[PDB]
Design a protein around this ligand. Structure first.
Ligand SMILES: Nc1ncc(OCC2CCCC2)cn1
Ligand SMILES: [Mg+2]
Ligand SMILES: [Zn+2]
Length: 313
C-alpha cells in the first residue's frame, strides 16, 4: 500500500475547491475518486484491488443517459469530498468511508426518469417501492455490487461497523429523494434557530448528512457559470425525454419537462434556485460554515440566470 495516486498539478490544486469540474476524460475519473478516498479517508481505508473492482462494477451499472450517468456519480462524490475536507473533525471514520461510496452509488442504474414517471407508467419498481422508488433501487444495486465476489470493500470492518456503514449509505441514498429534502431542511432550520441542533444526537447527524447529500446532488448549480450552463442542457435533455414519455401516456407534463416550452427554461431555473437550491445551501452554510463557497457560487449562478432573462446573455 505504498502506491499513492497523484493528479497533475492543476487538478491536485483545483480538486480541493468546491467548484472543481472533473473534466471530459472518463478514464481519469476512477483515479480522481481513489485520490479523494485516500486523502479523505486514508490510504488503508480500503484494499486497492477491491476498491478498483468496486468502482469498475459501479461504473458499468450507470447507464448512458444525458445527466444521471457515471460523470454525475463522480461529480456528486467530489462535492462530498470538498465538504468532508473543509469539516475535517466533524465526521467519524465510518462516515467518511460511507459517504463517498454513498455518493458514487447514489444514482446506480438510473434510467433518466423521475419517481413520478415510474408511478404513472406503473413500472414494477413502483410496486416494489411505494416511496423514494429509484432511491430504494439505487441502494439495492449498491448492496448487490458489494455482494459480488472480491467486491466487498468493507471486509476488514467488524460486524457492527459493517451494519453501521451500510445504514449510513442507505440513509444517505434515500436522502437524495428531493421530495424528502423540503421537510428535512425545514426541520434542520427549526433545530439550528431554536438552538436544539445537537451533533451527538444520531437522528440529528442523519438529517445533516441528508442535507449534505441534497447539497452534493444539486452541486451543478454551484459550479462556475460555463459549467452550470452546459450541465443545465444535460439536465433538460432528460426532463424533455420524460415530458415526451408523459405525452405518450396521455399526460401533459409540468412545463419544466415540456420541450415545447424551452423559452420558459431561464424562469424555471430562477424558481428552482429560489425554491430549492438557495434554501438548501443557506441552511447547510448555517450548520456547516466552511461550505459557504457553495452558497456564494449558487447566488452567482442565480444572478447569471437573471441576466439570461433580461437578454444580457
Ligand atoms: N439545475 C437544476 N437541477 C435540478 C433540477 O431539478 C428539478 C426538479 C423539479 C422536477 C424535476 C426535478 C432543476 N434544475
Ligand atoms: Mg437520484
Ligand atoms: Zn443524483
Amino acid at each position: 500500500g505504498l502506491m499513492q495516486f497523484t493528479l497533475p498539478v492543476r487538478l491536485c490544486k483545483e480538486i480541493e475547491l468546491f467548484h472543481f469540474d472533473i473534466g471530459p476524460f472518463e478514464n481519469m475519473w476512477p483515479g480522481i475518486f481513489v485520490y479523494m478516498v485516500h486523502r479523505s479517508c486514508g490510504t488503508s481505508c480500503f484494499e486497492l484491488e477491491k476498491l478498483c473492482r468496486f468502482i469498475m462494477s459501479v461504473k458499468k451499472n450507470y447507464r448512458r443517459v444525458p445527466y444521471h450517468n457515471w460523470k454525475h456519480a463522480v461529480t456528486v462524490a467530489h462535492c462530498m469530498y470538498a465538504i468532508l475536507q473543509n469539516n475535517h473533525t466533524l465526521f467519524t471514520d465510518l462516515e467518511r468511508k460511507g459517504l463517498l461510496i454513498a455518493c458514487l452509488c447514489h444514482d446506480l442504474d438510473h434510467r433518466g426518469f423521475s419517481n413520478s414517471y415510474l408511478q404513472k407508467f406503473d413500472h414494477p419498481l413502483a410496486a416494489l417501492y411505494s416511496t423514494s422508488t429509484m432511491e430504494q433501487h439505487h441502494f439495492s444495486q449498491t448492496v448487490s455490487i458489494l455482494q459480488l465476489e472480491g467486491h466487498n470493500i468493507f471486509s476488514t470492518l467488524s460486524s457492527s461497523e459493517y451494519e453501521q456503514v451500510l445504514e449510513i449509505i442507505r440513509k444517505a441514498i434515500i436522502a437524495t429523494d428531493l421530495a424528502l429534502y423540503f421537510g428535512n431542511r425545514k426541520q434542520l432550520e427549526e433545530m439550528y434557530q431554536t438552538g436544539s441542533l445537537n451533533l451527538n444526537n444520531q437522528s440529528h447527524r442523519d438529517r445533516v448528512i441528508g442535507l449534505m447529500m441534497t447539497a452534493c446532488d444539486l452541486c451543478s448549480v454551484t459550479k462556475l457559470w460555463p459549467v452550470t450552463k452546459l450541465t443545465a442542457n444535460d439536465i433538460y435533455a432528460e426532463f424533455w425525454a420524460e415530458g415526451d414519455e408523459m405525452k405518450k401516456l396521455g399526460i401533459q407534463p409540468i412545463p419544466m419537462m415540456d420541450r415545447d416550452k424551452k423559452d420558459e427554461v431561464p424562469q424555471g431555473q430562477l424558481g428552482f434556485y429560489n425554491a430549492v437550491a438557495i434554501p438548501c445551501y443557506t441552511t447547510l452554510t448555517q450548520i456547516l460554515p466552511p461550505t459557504e463557497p457553495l452558497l456564494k457560487a449558487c447566488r452567482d449562478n442565480l444572478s447569471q440566470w437573471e441576466k439570461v432573462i433580461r437578454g444580457e446573455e
